[PDB]
Design an enzyme around this catalytic site. Structure first.
Site, PDB file in Angstrom:
ATOM      1  N   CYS A   1       0.842  -1.187   0.000  1.00 44.34           N
ATOM      2  CA  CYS A   1       0.000   0.000   0.000  1.00 44.34           C
ATOM      3  C   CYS A   1       0.883   1.245   0.000  1.00 44.34           C
ATOM      4  O   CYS A   1       1.648   1.482   0.944  1.00 44.34           O
ATOM      5  CB  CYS A   1      -0.958  -0.009   1.199  1.00 44.34           C
ATOM      6  SG  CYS A   1      -2.235   1.311   1.218  1.00 44.34           S
TER       7      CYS A   1
ATOM      8  N   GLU B   1      -4.596   3.554 -10.690  1.00 45.76           N
ATOM      9  CA  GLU B   1      -5.362   2.320 -10.531  1.00 45.76           C
ATOM     10  C   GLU B   1      -6.504   2.245 -11.538  1.00 45.76           C
ATOM     11  O   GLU B   1      -6.721   1.203 -12.166  1.00 45.76           O
ATOM     12  CB  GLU B   1      -5.930   2.224  -9.121  1.00 45.76           C
ATOM     13  CG  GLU B   1      -4.912   2.069  -8.034  1.00 45.76           C
ATOM     14  CD  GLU B   1      -5.580   1.864  -6.704  1.00 45.76           C
ATOM     15  OE1 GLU B   1      -5.901   0.701  -6.375  1.00 45.76           O
ATOM     16  OE2 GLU B   1      -5.815   2.874  -6.004  1.00 45.76           O
TER      17      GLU B   1
ATOM     18  N   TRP C   1      -9.596   5.734  -0.770  1.00 41.54           N
ATOM     19  CA  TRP C   1      -9.891   6.402  -2.029  1.00 41.54           C
ATOM     20  C   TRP C   1      -8.836   5.983  -3.040  1.00 41.54           C
ATOM     21  O   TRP C   1      -7.725   5.603  -2.673  1.00 41.54           O
ATOM     22  CB  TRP C   1      -9.941   7.925  -1.873  1.00 41.54           C
ATOM     23  CG  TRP C   1      -8.746   8.518  -1.207  1.00 41.54           C
ATOM     24  CD1 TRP C   1      -7.544   8.799  -1.788  1.00 41.54           C
ATOM     25  CD2 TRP C   1      -8.633   8.930   0.165  1.00 41.54           C
ATOM     26  NE1 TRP C   1      -6.690   9.358  -0.866  1.00 41.54           N
ATOM     27  CE2 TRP C   1      -7.326   9.439   0.342  1.00 41.54           C
ATOM     28  CE3 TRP C   1      -9.497   8.905   1.258  1.00 41.54           C
ATOM     29  CZ2 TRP C   1      -6.869   9.921   1.567  1.00 41.54           C
ATOM     30  CZ3 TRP C   1      -9.043   9.395   2.479  1.00 41.54           C
ATOM     31  CH2 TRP C   1      -7.743   9.891   2.621  1.00 41.54           C
TER      32      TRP C   1
ATOM     33  N   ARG D   1      -0.110   4.539   2.834  1.00 42.14           N
ATOM     34  CA  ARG D   1      -0.043   4.346   4.280  1.00 42.14           C
ATOM     35  C   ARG D   1       0.268   5.616   5.076  1.00 42.14           C
ATOM     36  O   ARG D   1       0.239   5.554   6.308  1.00 42.14           O
ATOM     37  CB  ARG D   1       0.988   3.271   4.629  1.00 42.14           C
ATOM     38  CG  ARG D   1       0.499   1.853   4.381  1.00 42.14           C
ATOM     39  CD  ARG D   1       1.617   0.828   4.650  1.00 42.14           C
ATOM     40  NE  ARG D   1       2.571   0.700   3.546  1.00 42.14           N
ATOM     41  CZ  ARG D   1       3.746   0.072   3.638  1.00 42.14           C
ATOM     42  NH1 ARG D   1       4.112  -0.473   4.791  1.00 42.14           N
ATOM     43  NH2 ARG D   1       4.552  -0.020   2.581  1.00 42.14           N
TER      44      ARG D   1
HETATM   45  C1  HEM Z   1      -6.486   6.117   1.698  1.00 44.79           C
HETATM   46  C2  HEM Z   1      -5.932   6.014   0.481  1.00 44.79           C
HETATM   47  C3  HEM Z   1      -5.362   4.690  -0.099  1.00 44.79           C
HETATM   48  C4  HEM Z   1      -4.717   4.610  -1.269  1.00 44.79           C
HETATM   49  C5  HEM Z   1      -4.410   5.791  -2.215  1.00 44.79           C
HETATM   50  C6  HEM Z   1      -4.340   3.238  -1.510  1.00 44.79           C
HETATM   51  C7  HEM Z   1      -3.644   2.761  -2.610  1.00 44.79           C
HETATM   52  C8  HEM Z   1      -3.236   1.453  -2.792  1.00 44.79           C
HETATM   53  C9  HEM Z   1      -2.669   0.876  -3.991  1.00 44.79           C
HETATM   54  C10 HEM Z   1      -2.418   1.629  -5.312  1.00 44.79           C
HETATM   55  C11 HEM Z   1      -2.402  -0.413  -3.775  1.00 44.79           C
HETATM   56  C12 HEM Z   1      -1.800  -1.352  -4.849  1.00 44.79           C
HETATM   57  C13 HEM Z   1      -2.395  -2.752  -4.727  1.00 44.79           C
HETATM   58  C14 HEM Z   1      -2.909  -3.281  -6.036  1.00 44.79           C
HETATM   59  O1  HEM Z   1      -2.722  -2.600  -7.076  1.00 44.79           O
HETATM   60  O2  HEM Z   1      -3.503  -4.392  -6.017  1.00 44.79           O
HETATM   61  C15 HEM Z   1      -2.802  -0.711  -2.405  1.00 44.79           C
HETATM   62  C16 HEM Z   1      -2.708  -1.908  -1.732  1.00 44.79           C
HETATM   63  C17 HEM Z   1      -3.204  -2.246  -0.495  1.00 44.79           C
HETATM   64  N1  HEM Z   1      -3.817  -1.407   0.402  1.00 44.79           N
HETATM   65 FE1  HEM Z   1      -4.044   0.623   0.147  1.00 44.79          FE
HETATM   66  N2  HEM Z   1      -4.793   2.500  -0.432  1.00 44.79           N
HETATM   67  C18 HEM Z   1      -5.440   3.347   0.461  1.00 44.79           C
HETATM   68  C19 HEM Z   1      -6.041   2.957   1.658  1.00 44.79           C
HETATM   69  C20 HEM Z   1      -5.977   1.725   2.286  1.00 44.79           C
HETATM   70  C21 HEM Z   1      -6.677   1.310   3.501  1.00 44.79           C
HETATM   71  C22 HEM Z   1      -7.654   2.204   4.310  1.00 44.79           C
HETATM   72  C23 HEM Z   1      -6.338   0.029   3.755  1.00 44.79           C
HETATM   73  C24 HEM Z   1      -6.772  -0.894   4.925  1.00 44.79           C
HETATM   74  C25 HEM Z   1      -7.327  -0.464   6.057  1.00 44.79           C
HETATM   75  C26 HEM Z   1      -5.406  -0.402   2.726  1.00 44.79           C
HETATM   76  C27 HEM Z   1      -4.804  -1.647   2.632  1.00 44.79           C
HETATM   77  C28 HEM Z   1      -4.164  -2.152   1.515  1.00 44.79           C
HETATM   78  C29 HEM Z   1      -3.735  -3.522   1.284  1.00 44.79           C
HETATM   79  C30 HEM Z   1      -3.898  -4.717   2.248  1.00 44.79           C
HETATM   80  C31 HEM Z   1      -3.158  -3.568   0.087  1.00 44.79           C
HETATM   81  C32 HEM Z   1      -2.550  -4.806  -0.603  1.00 44.79           C
HETATM   82  C33 HEM Z   1      -3.686  -5.508  -1.336  1.00 44.79           C
HETATM   83  C34 HEM Z   1      -3.195  -6.132  -2.612  1.00 44.79           C
HETATM   84  O3  HEM Z   1      -2.076  -5.776  -3.055  1.00 44.79           O
HETATM   85  O4  HEM Z   1      -3.932  -6.981  -3.178  1.00 44.79           O
HETATM   86  N3  HEM Z   1      -5.216   0.653   1.857  1.00 44.79           N
HETATM   87  N4  HEM Z   1      -3.296   0.451  -1.845  1.00 44.79           N
HETATM   88  C1  LIG Z   2      -4.030  -4.803  -9.020  1.00 34.99           C
HETATM   89  N1  LIG Z   2      -5.248  -4.201  -9.573  1.00 34.99           N
HETATM   90  C2  LIG Z   2      -4.972  -3.670 -10.910  1.00 34.99           C
HETATM   91  C3  LIG Z   2      -6.303  -5.224  -9.657  1.00 34.99           C
HETATM   92  C4  LIG Z   2      -7.519  -4.782  -8.844  1.00 34.99           C
HETATM   93  C5  LIG Z   2      -7.213  -4.786  -7.359  1.00 34.99           C
HETATM   94  C6  LIG Z   2      -6.698  -5.914  -6.725  1.00 34.99           C
HETATM   95  C7  LIG Z   2      -6.427  -5.887  -5.358  1.00 34.99           C
HETATM   96  F1  LIG Z   2      -5.930  -6.975  -4.744  1.00 34.99           F
HETATM   97  C8  LIG Z   2      -6.666  -4.737  -4.621  1.00 34.99           C
HETATM   98  F2  LIG Z   2      -6.403  -4.725  -3.299  1.00 34.99           F
HETATM   99  C9  LIG Z   2      -7.177  -3.613  -5.253  1.00 34.99           C
HETATM  100  C10 LIG Z   2      -7.448  -2.339  -4.486  1.00 34.99           C
HETATM  101  C11 LIG Z   2      -6.187  -1.755  -3.846  1.00 34.99           C
HETATM  102  C12 LIG Z   2      -6.645  -0.513  -3.128  1.00 34.99           C
HETATM  103  C13 LIG Z   2      -7.189  -0.627  -1.862  1.00 34.99           C
HETATM  104  C14 LIG Z   2      -7.619   0.509  -1.201  1.00 34.99           C
HETATM  105  C15 LIG Z   2      -8.199   0.369   0.152  1.00 34.99           C
HETATM  106  F3  LIG Z   2      -8.620   1.576   0.635  1.00 34.99           F
HETATM  107  F4  LIG Z   2      -9.265  -0.493   0.075  1.00 34.99           F
HETATM  108  C16 LIG Z   2      -7.505   1.743  -1.815  1.00 34.99           C
HETATM  109  C17 LIG Z   2      -6.953   1.816  -3.090  1.00 34.99           C
HETATM  110  N2  LIG Z   2      -6.834   3.012  -3.719  1.00 34.99           N
HETATM  111  N3  LIG Z   2      -6.544   0.689  -3.714  1.00 34.99           N
HETATM  112  C18 LIG Z   2      -7.450  -3.639  -6.614  1.00 34.99           C
HETATM  113 CL   LIG Z   3      -9.552  -1.342  -8.499  1.00 35.32          CL
END
Ligand code: HEM
Ligand SMILES: CN(C)CCc1cc(F)c(F)c(CCc2cc(C(F)F)cc(N)n2)c1
Ligand SMILES: [Cl-]
Ligand code: HEM
Ligand SMILES: CN(C)CCc1cc(F)c(F)c(CCc2cc(C(F)F)cc(N)n2)c1
Ligand SMILES: C[C@H](O)[C@H](O)[C@H]1CNc2nc(N)[nH]c(=O)c2N1
Ligand SMILES: C[C@H](O)[C@H](O)[C@H]1CNc2nc(N)[nH]c(=O)c2N1
Ligand SMILES: [Cl-]
Ligand SMILES: [Gd]
Ligand SMILES: [Gd]
Ligand SMILES: [Zn+2]
Lengths: 401, 402
Positions: free
Chosen positions: A105, A282, A277, A108
């Site tokens: 993420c 993305e 958000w 963070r």
């Molecule tokens: C508030 C603004 C936030 C932004 C801009 C953001 C953005 C992102 C992005 C771009 C990824 C890349 C993962 C992917 O492409 O699959 C990610 C992963 C992740 N985020 Fe955040 N996120 C936000 C909030 C949060 C919150 C509130 C949580 C949990 C309470 C969180 C937990 C996670 C987790 C567990 C991943 C890894 C999931 C995965 O890679 O499949 N994020 N986030």
């Molecule tokens: C890798 N993508 C292209 C495939 C779709 C995809 C797969 C995932 F496992 C995944 F976690 C997400 C959301 C990540 C994310 C989570 C949050 C959080 F606030 F909930 C905010 C944000 N901005 N983005 C998207």
């Molecule tokens: Cl998405």
């Protein structure tokens, strides 16, 4: 302790936090597997003890009465029942630390501001549905998005699991045709076929919001149609390209991950949706332009009259930038919180610096922190990173079928 | 065996070749360090050498034959008598190619078998060394139709110091610490520039002054050699539709020629073995010109382009970078100097991966170095999982000789 260098500035730090790594990861001295997405009885007290010590140090209350006290009631709770319940403050502290620890993420810097809805006394699928609906309306907040997580009952032995079958709370449908190919989102073809299977009337469009499949323990799933006024969406237009709006593209405001498993202090919450958000890439780069997703890149380039006959015209790169421009412009015009990849990564560099002073390091997954367009134009590109697993955490989990 | 998915297609393979990885990298089950740029007795020389000869005899479809076991016994007897051994010429050609083939951070490896090997193991002095290098530059440049080549100088051996090329590449631009605190020229080359001046080079003061070569013969101080200007082919940069771009005075050189890496073949070490190919446009357009710590031209370009640089969400940085890459490609094509764009390069690396899975059961690849620095997920390698590991023969980093 691993040396970590920033190549833009020349600065060096050491990741001392890497010592505490709980769940060993995928890499060995023989080969690195860091680029892989998914890398393939009373031990409950070890993780509970350490989590409780985490909580009290974080409030400057190590080695003092209430800390001593709380260590005993968890002992007695597991002795009696085989598990334990988390105090409210602890569940809140644990949800925020799971987010803080998520190596992938880039958002963070916000980990401290998280709204934690306690749904641990949930009892039915209809109950879930209204919990999820409070969250959505709260998180969405008419487009001034607010990070939030809802924690449903922790799993216990001999009894079924609370699970949300959709990967997110908002997902567009994916339909096959008289020729195999897909209208809609190809990422959600499987779940679209489950929703139709369990009674849903499929639409005809490319942006049909799927219904929720919510699973109360030991019962099958139940279909729940989302209130359309609760799914805030953004039609996509470009500031200067007037035809872009005619392409009919849309995306939803709330990214809400509804299939991951929250683990705090040895307790496991298989249903704990969290939301924040979007970062613009993305939507604009991955969701709309991945070849296996909406794959719109060539269609936008034809409208821009670009030379798609040679790769060295960089027509792909030009169309992609404009698709991201339209996403940002659209979300801003609709007053929906969104953050571009330059602002996002700059904020993450600040998170790294904070984390270095606070905890002596930060688990970060380079390949996922670096944005999918303009990588070396952002500062995280030139930053070395160490990836490892800390608890509490969000974990991946099998599909409940 | 590690399972490897292509997320764009659904492909799944198993990297069985990773299990033969001999030398160890920096990761552990505790923590991944893949993103770190620098992740680092006769019996052990024997076992490396034994393994290489086995590799060579496999390649000529003569494994287990008369000549194969002859050569094994030959090398051991020579290690016993002299503590080292000598490669036959064909073994040296094969080992140089494998070293390229095995380089995990190289996206151009579809070409690995088309490599011209110059045997300079008879080289005697810095002066002869210089002559060999000029012939390498001339052959590889080939008037803009670039050819991949490597020149191999004498191997490390006990009793004598190493040949070393002090310069990190054969063609580098000077970087002069300025009046206030700025660098004029390439900031990546401040150290080597200072070394040249302290060794009697008369500096210039432009932004694109080509550096002299510092060449080290065994147990000799380095010696300064100037490259004849007509040997160093350069490309003035212009933009096809932004005519003010020519007025920036930017140039880049034709030949990327790495000169500071160590070539390892069957336990033997060649600390001086410069190799060259041709550029991929993003190395020049994105990294060399737009990195904040390099020429750092991004803001100036965007301002000329009339972009709004006061807010990040207008994507001025991305827009200006795309046009700098357009300019690099158009300029090299206009000048008839070989160049490959990151879309064509990453697509031929996908074919490389496929050829290598059939040939060897996998391919060592460093994802973060393979994925281009702009438009990453627009290329197919982004959606390809990869397994990074060390196979020998290899090019290795080595410490600077000062
Ligand atoms: C508030 C603004 C936030 C932004 C801009 C953001 C953005 C992102 C992005 C771009 C990824 C890349 C993962 C992917 O492409 O699959 C990610 C992963 C992740 N985020 Fe955040 N996120 C936000 C909030 C949060 C919150 C509130 C949580 C949990 C309470 C969180 C937990 C996670 C987790 C567990 C991943 C890894 C999931 C995965 O890679 O499949 N994020 N986030
Ligand atoms: C890798 N993508 C292209 C495939 C779709 C995809 C797969 C995932 F496992 C995944 F976690 C997400 C959301 C990540 C994310 C989570 C949050 C959080 F606030 F909930 C905010 C944000 N901005 N983005 C998207
Ligand atoms: Cl998405
Ligand atoms: C023919 C065209 C070639 C292309 C287009 C190409 C492309 C690239 C690129 C883009 C990189 C990463 C650059 C960076 O450090 O940012 C790289 C690295 C590398 N290449 Fe190639 N290359 C070519 C030829 C060769 C040849 C002929 C050799 C050796 C015989 C070679 C060996 C290597 C090695 C060892 C690295 C890693 C160096 C490092 O760690 O930075 N390459 N290549
Ligand atoms: C940030 N970057 C600049 C790191 C500096 C750097 C370090 C290296 F070890 C290195 F080999 C390079 C050039 C790679 C390269 C090599 C070749 C081959 F023919 F020689 C061709 C090509 N197109 N590219 C650059
Ligand atoms: C810190 C980070 O690993 C480092 O800047 C790497 C990332 N990927 C790269 N990829 C290439 N081709 N060249 C590089 O210099 C780098 N730098
Ligand atoms: C193969 C590669 O590791 C994989 O496709 C990853 C790379 N980094 C990513 N980063 C994000 N944010 N999302 C992704 O889907 C991916 N895909
Ligand atoms: Cl370079
Ligand atoms: Gd038109
Ligand atoms: Gd013009
Ligand atoms: Zn690793």
């Amino acid at each position: 302790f691993p040396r970590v260098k920033n190549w833009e500035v020349g600065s060096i730090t050491y990741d001392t936090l890497s010592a505490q790594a709980q769940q060993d990861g995928p890499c060995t001295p023989r080969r690195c597997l860091g680029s892989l997405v998914f890398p393939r009885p009373e031990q409950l007290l070890s993780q509970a003890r350490d989590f409780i010590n985490q909580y009290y140090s974080s409030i400057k209350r190590s080695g003092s009465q209430a800390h001593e006290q709380r260590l005993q009631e968890v002992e007695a709770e597991v002795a009696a029942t085989g598990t334990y319940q988390l105090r409210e403050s602890e569940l809140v502290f644990g949800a925020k630390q799971a987010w803080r620890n998520a190596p992938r993420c880039v958002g963070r810097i916000q980990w401290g501001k998280l709204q934690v809805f306690d749904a641990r006394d949930c009892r039915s699928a209809q109950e879930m549905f209204t919990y999820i609906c409070n969250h959505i309306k709260y998180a969405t907040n008419r487009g001034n998005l607010r990070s939030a997580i809802t924690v449903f009952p922790q799993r216990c032995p001999g009894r079924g699991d609370f699970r949300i079958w959709n990967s997110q709370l908002v997902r567009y449908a994916g339909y096959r045709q008289q020729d195999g190919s897909v209208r809609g989102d190809p990422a959600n073809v499987e779940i679209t076929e489950l929703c139709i299977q369990h009674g849903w009337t499929p639409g005809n469009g490319r942006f049909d919001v799927l219904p929720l499949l919510l699973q109360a323990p030991d019962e099958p799933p139940e279909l729940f149609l989302l209130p359309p006024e609760l799914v805030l969406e953004v039609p996509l237009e470009h500031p200067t390209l007037e035809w872009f709006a005619a392409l009919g593209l849309r995306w939803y405001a709330l990214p809400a991950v509804s299939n991951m498993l929250l683990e705090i202090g040895g307790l496991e919450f298989p249903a704990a949706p969290f939301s924040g958000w979007y970062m613009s890439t993305e939507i604009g780069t991955r969701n709309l332009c991945d070849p296996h997703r909406y794959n719109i890149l060539e269609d936008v380039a034809v409208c821009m009259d670009l030379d798609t006959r040679t790769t060295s015209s960089l027509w792909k790169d030009k169309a992609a930038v404009e698709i991201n421009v339209a996403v940002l412009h659209s979300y801003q015009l609709a007053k929906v919180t969104i953050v571009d990849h330059h602002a996002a990564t700059a904020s993450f560099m600040k998170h790294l610096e904070n984390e270095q002073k606070a905890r002596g390091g930060c688990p970060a997954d380079w390949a996922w922190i670096v944005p999918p367009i303009s990588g070396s134009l952002t500062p995280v590109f030139h930053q070395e990173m160490v990836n490892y697993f800390l608890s509490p955490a969000f974990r991946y989990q099998p599909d409940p079928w």
